[PDB]
Amino acid sequence: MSKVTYIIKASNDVLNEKTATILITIAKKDFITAAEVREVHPDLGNAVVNSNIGVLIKKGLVEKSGDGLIITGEAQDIISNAATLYAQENAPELLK
């Protein structure tokens, strides 16, 4: 169900699924790249995937540290907050 919807929640209705997962993929990995974000995805979607990283970038949040992408403080609050919202409902092993 899982975390991106919570990312959307935590950010405050910026993300979709698509940007939430993409911001996540970068956010986790310090010097990912855009390439890796392309490379992972099952279900981001190559055309969207280009958009989602850039659209984070054009806001903030992610900062490209070049040559991989890595997130600002702004993301870092969102991801921590959102993952915690994941934690309540998923709860790896946490609540259940």
From Swiss-Prot:
Q: Report a single Gene Ontology molecular function.
A: DNA binding
**Swiss-Prot/TrEMBL keywords:** Activator, DNA-binding, Transcription, Transcription regulation
Q: Which domain of life is it from?
A: Viruses
- Entry keyword annotation includes Lipid biosynthesis: no
* Segments of the chain annotated as binding DNA: 23-42
Which residue positions does the secretion signal occupy? none
UniProt keyword annotation of Transcription regulation present: yes
Please describe what this protein does.
Required for the transcriptional activation of middle promoters. Middle promoters are characterized by the presence of the conserved sequence [AT]3TGCTTNA (MotA box). MotA binds directly to MotA boxes.
Additional observations: MotA synthesis starts immediately after infection and stops abruptly some 4-5 minutes later.
Entry protein name: Middle transcription regulatory protein motA
Gene (UniProt): motA
